[PDB]
Design a protein around this ligand. Sequence first.
Ligand SMILES: CN[C@@H]1[C@@H](O)[C@@H](O[C@@H]2[C@@H](O)[C@H](O[C@H]3OC(CN)=CC[C@H]3N)[C@@H](N)C[C@H]2N)OC[C@]1(C)O
Ligand SMILES: [Mg+2]
Length: 267
Amino acid sequence: TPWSKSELVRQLRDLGVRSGDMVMPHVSLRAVGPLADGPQTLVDALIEAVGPTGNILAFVSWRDSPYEQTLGHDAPPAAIAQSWPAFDPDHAPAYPGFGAINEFIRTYPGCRRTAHPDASMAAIGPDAAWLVAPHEMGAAYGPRSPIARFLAHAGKILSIGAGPDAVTALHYAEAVARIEGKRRVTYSMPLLREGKRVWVTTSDWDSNGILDEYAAPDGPDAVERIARDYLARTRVAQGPVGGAQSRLIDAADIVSFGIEWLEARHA
Ligand SMILES: CN[C@@H]1[C@@H](O)[C@@H](O[C@@H]2[C@@H](O)[C@H](O[C@H]3OC(CN)=CC[C@H]3N)[C@@H](N)C[C@H]2N)OC[C@]1(C)O
Ligand SMILES: [Mg+2]
């Protein structure tokens, strides 16, 4: 039988989601199973669970981010530079590889979207505008990003059937860790700057592997290795949401752990 909004809200409350919480979900819809009115049912359940004073923050990115095509160039190649659509936060679809639920979050009425085309975050709730801005090129997941404000706002990570590699907030630990040899990438994004398309070239920490040994195309990256160690060592609320095994993680706690994990292992 497909899961109803009411059943999912009960499960989320049993897991520990409280009215007023600040939640960042990572969702595998296949693990959840069938939903009364499709994925919107889970979106509706999350909003009801955090209540009218709570907030949801999601890493949605952009279906058509030209990351691969501009990576490692000092400027966008001529072909992509002339024809690539500028990032339009109001209409740009979410990146499907990070979860099919994110397109439903970002089109939710009142949802705010951050300005970073590749690292775009979406937020719902009274603190949404404060969460999503600023989000500047060069500050994808580190200090001054929405992730940083999420961590300072008692954020909780809600993993619904997602694996330990999916914990975006741990890229903040990579950004701030005092370790040698940190990898950086250069890429270009097409922004809308008062109506006109402008290409911006920036560098930032490599979110596909902060060090060479975490950068194999098949992982495990540092996010995954940190999260596995953390979950083996920490009491974490665990339970079902629909058919999916779910966890509710204190975001500040796992990031602090990840900073220490990286700094203990790399001089
Ligand atoms: C939309 N543009 C995207 C661009 O943002 C970036 O995505 C990163 C992403 O794959 C990382 O997730 C993968 O990590 C690894 C091992 N590296 C394999 C499986 C995933 N867990 C995530 N942790 C950080 C993301 N920024 O590279 C790909 C891209 C499609 O170009
Ligand atoms: Mg508030």
